[PDB]
Design a protein around this ligand. Sequence first.
Ligand SMILES: *[C@@H]1O[C@H](CO)[C@@H](O[C@@H]2O[C@H](CO)[C@@H](O)[C@H](O)[C@H]2NC(C)=O)[C@H](O)[C@H]1NC(C)=O
Ligand SMILES: *[C@@H]1O[C@H](CO)[C@@H](O)[C@H](O)[C@H]1NC(C)=O
Lengths: 438, 52
Amino acid sequence: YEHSTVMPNVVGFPYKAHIERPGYSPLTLQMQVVETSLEPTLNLEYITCEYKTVVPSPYVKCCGASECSTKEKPDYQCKVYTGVYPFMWGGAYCFCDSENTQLSEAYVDRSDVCRHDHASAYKAHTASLKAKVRVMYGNVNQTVDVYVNGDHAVTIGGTQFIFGPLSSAWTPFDNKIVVYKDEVFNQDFPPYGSGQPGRFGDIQSRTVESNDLYANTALKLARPSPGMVHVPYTQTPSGFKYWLKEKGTALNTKAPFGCQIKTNPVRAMNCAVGNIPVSMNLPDSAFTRIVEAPTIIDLTCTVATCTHSSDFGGVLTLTYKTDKNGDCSVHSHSNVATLQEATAKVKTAGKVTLHFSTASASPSFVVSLCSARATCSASCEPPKDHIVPYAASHSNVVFPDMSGTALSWVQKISGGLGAFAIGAILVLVVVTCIGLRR
Amino acid sequence: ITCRVPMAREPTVIHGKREVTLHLHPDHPTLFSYRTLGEDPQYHEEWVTAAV
Ligand SMILES: *[C@@H]1O[C@H](CO)[C@@H](O[C@@H]2O[C@H](CO)[C@@H](O)[C@H](O)[C@H]2NC(C)=O)[C@H](O)[C@H]1NC(C)=O
Ligand SMILES: *[C@@H]1O[C@H](CO)[C@@H](O)[C@H](O)[C@H]1NC(C)=O
């Protein structure tokens, strides 16, 4: 036997599915969602870390001029200066008063801790979905890990389950993201090779172990002060520290739908959106024949108390007469009210009690116990507690039933007005007919 | 290594009609943030220093 249904993608919300086939008693399947995960596919663009400025000891030549040649190093900067008289703790360095020459060079490299502290730039693509689902029926109660793709097929108790695909392709990650430690940011970054000094991306590298580095930090050199041995340089501070200072707000405290963001791997959990279609194939050994199932006749329903709240605020009682004791599968055939127990025990006494939750002023729904059905309708009163610490356990419906008090008043007023209008129509027609007869 | 931080004092909650009132009593500058779980969220975050 094959069946297909849909379930809301809400974590922790119980779902009950009804399977009815000729020649067998109805079966109720309980399915719940424990934890969901959504992961995009990432391709790394570059990583960034704080830099260090390497400056070697300056070269000094007495009565000679030394020219320096270019080198293949990141942001290499070399200069030569004429007419210098270096001093030291002993005295003068060279005889030549004005014929000396000083050569100074500097460059930039990655920090010694870039392997431990770095920020990564990623591009986000289409995302997958993994779920953990708990399935209950008969004497089977098992939790399984599935891919919500329409591809994975799992076997539980000889029953084949196929989940997905999701009915709303929505992702909280933008096209370009930046990841640091355990926070993800939805910001755009400069392209490789076009970094600007002072902001994010001042130095870039294709990977952590790459041997090539692109840096642009304005390493401008300056002439040494007279009577001194030093090399001065002015450089715009590291853009990585500045970005760490005022990065902004992370996606962790901004993602919609209560999407818990985690890193390593980058993923979003418990994101409540859309619904999941479920296709199932059942064996013939999970049902019960009609002959050995109990018989229910003359089933009437009534409601003892109701109060529409997030909790299971409602109680109903079913009266009935049977021929033997047994166990039945009970269900509600609507969406206004959601039950609590999927099974019940029927005895010869003839009274069973059930719990239910709702969100409308006056609900009306059909309740089925084994092969018998009945209709339940009652009035409910609003609760007093303003705020509760647990999520709602009822599907949000507010529209009342056509036989409720408010709609009853509407119907009575409309019927009176319509009857009066129809009488006016009839009298006008009669008068015009008697007029045209003449 | 593993290094130690203290837990902040629980705030005072006062209920209301689709609102809450939080009394915050910090001992150190502490970060306070909140968001809504709807379609478009109204995020907010700040550095609370004195009792508010
Ligand atoms: C020793 O000192 C003399 C001068 O005190 C240096 O001779 C100078 O050399 C430069 C370039 O070689 C010339 O431009 C100057 O005209 C020279 N000065 C004189 C007075 O001749 C000499 O180079 C020094 N040698 C060493 C090894 O330090
Ligand atoms: C199903 O199994 C889980 C795991 O042991 C348990 O927590 C849960 O109560 C079980 N449900 C029933 C109805 O026995």
